[PDB]
Amino acid sequence: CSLIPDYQRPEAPVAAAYPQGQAYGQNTGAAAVPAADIGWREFFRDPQLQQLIGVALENNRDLRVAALNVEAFRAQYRIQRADLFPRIGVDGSGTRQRLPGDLSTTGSPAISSQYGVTLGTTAWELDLFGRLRSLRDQALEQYLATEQAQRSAQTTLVASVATAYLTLKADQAQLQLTKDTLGTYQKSFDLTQRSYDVGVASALDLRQAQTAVEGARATLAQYTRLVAQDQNALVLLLGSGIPANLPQGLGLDQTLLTEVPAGLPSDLLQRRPDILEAEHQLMAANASIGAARAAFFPSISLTANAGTMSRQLSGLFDAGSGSWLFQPSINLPIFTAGSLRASLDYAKIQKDINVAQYEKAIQTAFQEVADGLAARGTFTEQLQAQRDLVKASDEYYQLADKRYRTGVDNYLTLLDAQRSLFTAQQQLITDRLNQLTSEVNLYKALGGGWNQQTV
Amino acid sequence: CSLIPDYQRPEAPVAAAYPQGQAYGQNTGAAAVPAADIGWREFFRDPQLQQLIGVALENNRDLRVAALNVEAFRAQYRIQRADLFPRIGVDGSGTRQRLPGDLSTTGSPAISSQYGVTLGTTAWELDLFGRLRSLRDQALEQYLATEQAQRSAQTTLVASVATAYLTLKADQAQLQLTKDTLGTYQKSFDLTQRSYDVGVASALDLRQAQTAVEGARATLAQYTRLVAQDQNALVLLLGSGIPANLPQGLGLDQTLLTEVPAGLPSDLLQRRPDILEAEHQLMAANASIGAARAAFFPSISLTANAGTMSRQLSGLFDAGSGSWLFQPSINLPIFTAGSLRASLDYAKIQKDINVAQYEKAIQTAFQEVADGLAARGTFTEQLQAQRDLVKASDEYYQLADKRYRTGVDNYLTLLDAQRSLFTAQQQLITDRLNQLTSEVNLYKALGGGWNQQTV
Amino acid sequence: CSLIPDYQRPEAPVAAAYPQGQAYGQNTGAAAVPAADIGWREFFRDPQLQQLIGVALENNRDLRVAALNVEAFRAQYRIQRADLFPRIGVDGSGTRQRLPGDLSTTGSPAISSQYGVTLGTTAWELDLFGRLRSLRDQALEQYLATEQAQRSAQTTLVASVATAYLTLKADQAQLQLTKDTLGTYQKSFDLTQRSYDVGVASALDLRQAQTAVEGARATLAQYTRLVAQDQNALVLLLGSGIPANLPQGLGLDQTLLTEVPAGLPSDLLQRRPDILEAEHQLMAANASIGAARAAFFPSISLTANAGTMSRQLSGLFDAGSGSWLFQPSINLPIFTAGSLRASLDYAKIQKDINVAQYEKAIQTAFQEVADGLAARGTFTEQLQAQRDLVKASDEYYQLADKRYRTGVDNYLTLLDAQRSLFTAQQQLITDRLNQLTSEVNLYKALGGGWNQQTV
């Protein structure tokens, strides 16, 4: 006679399609393969980043805490599963007592000493009504909830290592462009110091060129420390240090990522691990309903023992000294003060709070995926505009070079065209860094990379 | 006799007046109508914002978690109140035992059955020294603490919906200005393309106009993204989507929300919810002192019982079989190994943990209110300087338009003046967003939006 | 017998030296005096900041919570250490029997009773195989973990008050320079208003003068707001107000601090506090697996009595009415169905979890220290570039002042030169702020805010 109630799936409050507008693109229907099935070996193309994630899934320690928390709750489920069963041990019953002359058996103050070992249960409570069954069911639901949360931890780790590597590549490209702008400012100050010695340029243009060079040196040192900062952050996120023999990974100009189907908002309820973690927390509260409801009914205990008793220790292995104890007990609360109804509606409160936790998880997951959809809809237009800016600034540089080569234009204006080209490329690097990090965050938000390859 | 210690509250470490200087305003005297009295309908002037609070206030999930955690701790208080009273029920306790020949009555190994069903209690205590009653009002004051926590959760919900809606309107106005800057850049590029196709302008300023247009299209894609992400954030924070029948929402430069009287710093000790939460955790710590003190005094307990006992199982109809037990049980710990000093010491240490927690909540409340007062004091000067900036740039554009319409300058300088006026309007909208965000956080920090009208 | 397993030979999860690159200067090798025995009075040369740290230590409330948590775990260690020693305490027992005539010892249904007062113990277990010994060892090592957590809280509080005071003083300097820029713009607007009222400059130059002045007055109000917010944040981090009798502090130009020798990565895990509290949580997990391994063994328990009993109230303290009870019990389980095995596995997994958290703590310490070393290596050459920029703009301003005093250029070009000099000093002051706040963060990351008294 089990008393866990019938499970009822809570409805999702999310509308059945991802939101439309001027910033989004056109959605598709159901996908043959969702995002939670293409692994981090196919979605991540370049070999260096695949080797870094293959290192960081093993050497990092937060994923190790996640997997060990899973195996800890294996042990914690095994506790309750064995608590459903007896504990067949021994015990030693020894009562050496002194009573007055009125209370004893001899009519005199006497020291009586009966002591002898015996095996059997120590108040083993048998489970007629399903309260121990529902406690181990709660333990099993908590176990597989946390082994869904381990997949959620691996998802966040793969996304964080990917964003750390992409910011490392983009920030060392920024460092190279600031080094090149420092080179052009140094050449312009060299020419202004040359024209200052001869006498064409006054000392005001010399001080202006010197302020420009010192600003470029400050920018160069700041990007040097930023490369050091996010390289140390990647050393943290890999667990171990960066290995030496990494392959020549693909730069930012190639297609570093693959296309991912968005799908339906109702498809997300079975694939993202945070959703299906909060769902099994809700099933654990569903088992706690039965754990609190199975207190109203008669709980049955057993106390059995079997072993030899004696008076002296010397005559404990002989004939006629066998013994055995059998003691059942039933128990039924006629009128408590309201602790059982308080435990029942407290379990119902925990059930509805975990309903709210599951539904909040669906809402935040839908918001993160709609964030990723809006960014994937707008960054293609932003980077098309930015690459047209880079191409127009490069054509302006080539025309300033073509005016310089024939002689009608100075070298300082050619260096101004070089620095406007480098400002255009420094903007392009950061816009593509924002595109790639939001693409990785969208892949995390849909189903994440838990499988290694496509299944 | 009860044993809970008497409680006077700790005084506030923060000053008796809000800070003064060049940033703040003059101090108001007191509050006849304080800040927590004014509801969100007599504070928020948008009917759209009133409808969005009316949706989000009962259709959220985290506020639902708080409002059900209140019910959870009422269930825990019902547990602790019901454990004052005995466990009056029915039980049937049979013992079948084998005894060896030395321990039996007749001297021969035989059996002896004790099959008797009884009614009554097992091991309940009455504490006339005040241990269970101190645990009872500890549970009561944890309930009062978490209902104050529920009020603070609704307060932060109201502040977050208001800030998300104000940033949504500000990003709408940002997008409507970025479309016009893109219009003026595209029109200036069409003029330079016509000037290039005839032959007046070179290719260099044509590439400059192309880079300007592509910068405008990049920032247009960025603001479409940012508007879509802000709508997704407000879909998260309402709980459901934006509903259908929204009324008219007024502008951003009008009176979006009325002024709030600040009052004294001591009025936070009664109006603010989180300070009252720390207050009730402090008096629950005093109740826990009274519980962990009352174990020195002797506990009086008894296991009352009344039933029908017999050797045989089939019989209880006899008139003489009205069996009953009384069994009182009184204990007294006279000298342990310093267990009870350690328990009383740990409870007193928890009390002056919660003292420090209480005045740390006071100090963070005072800091949030003082930053809100500084924002009130400085944003009037900043926003008036910003409106004078916008008036100056508007008059400059009007004079450039008069200069163009008479015929002296061309249309490119008119488009440059128009872009300067658009940049001034953009910075005005950002500063007004900052003012409204800081005053919503000030209203959140003073007393919050709990009730609607007066009591 | 004790069953706590042996401690393991430590492997390093880190390279044996701080990294090298363009940012990193050069390793200093090992150090004689580490970074933890440099107290905050021989490190912070600023006497005003030293009194501010003194107020922040004897007045803030997070240190009250931390030191009171250490006191709470002293009480918890005593309440778990006291479980070895026998809880002896005089008590009072009694029964009042109603057995029927089938069950009575005489043959008629009668009333029987047996009561008495006995000095003795109740269900005391003798810790023969070290389970409660292992639990008090666990409580002792969690006490040491709580003490190292208090040391970590104190060094982070010293760092936070140093950085808050430092940003306060730097934003005082920022407010003073933007008040000077507002002065120069107001004087340039006075000159342009005269040059308009006479007739030379048109109204468009007057509108550029107004847009400059209103931009500057907006930024002046913004920095008054920001100084007020940062001073209220410093009031939060102190817990008490700024005291009145402060000495004259040192400005940001001269050395407020000195460089602390970093050393090797091998004395982090001896000097840093959070690594040590992770180490003591690991030791507590070793004691937990000691108790779990001792759980297989037989757990002997005892009761005892030395008092008197009788059946009558008026004669229980007569001669020869003494009583005495001895109750030994050897108890070992044989069949546990995988419960004690499961709790053993759960404690081994707690050991592995605390190993992983200790190793994570070493990795986060190494990452934060390496970021501090990056900042120390780069901010020197960046600040040299910034000071050369300020000196070149100051020479440019001296040349523009010579051109003004002779009579070649008007006063508006000198105000343009002051506009450039002031923003040069703006960027210099915020860069020196970044250097000093990252130096304080490195000093926290090596873990040296603890000692003021002797060792």
Author numbering:
A (entry chain A), B (entry chain C), C (entry chain B): 1 to 455
The authors write:
Here, we report a structure of the wild-type multidrug efflux pump MexAB–OprM from P. aeruginosa at near-atomic resolution, in the presence or absence of drug. MexB does not directly contact OprM; instead, MexA joins MexB and OprM by forming a funnel-like hexamer.
During this analysis, we identified two modes of binding of OprM to MexA; accordingly, we determined the structures of both states of MexAB–OprM pumps at resolutions of 3.64 Å (state A) and 3.76 Å (state B). State A and state B are quite similar (Cα RMSD: 0.47); however, the relative positions of OprM in each state are related by a 60° rotation. In the 0° state, H3–H4 of OprM face the α-hairpin tips of the LC protomers, whereas H7–H8 face the α-hairpin tips of the SC protomers. The contact surface areas between the MexA hexamer and OprM trimer are 2992 Å2 (0° state) and 2983 Å2 (60° state). Several hydrogen bonds are present between main chains: Q104 in MexA binds to A203 or Y411 in OprM, and K108 in MexA binds to G199 or G407 in OprM. Also, L100 in MexA engages in hydrophobic interactions with V198 and V200 on H3–H4 or V408 on H7–H8. Moreover, the side chain of R403 in OprM extends inward from H7 and seems to form a hydrogen bond with the main chain of A105 in MexA. These results suggest that the two modes of binding between MexA and OprM do not differ significantly. When OprM states were separated in single-particle analysis, the ratio of particles in the 0° versus 60° states was 45:55 (in the absence of drug) and 58:42 (in the presence of novobiocin), suggested an overall ratio of nearly 1:1. Consequently, in the cryo-EM structure, all three MexB protomers are closed toward the outside, representing a state that cannot accommodate drug molecules.
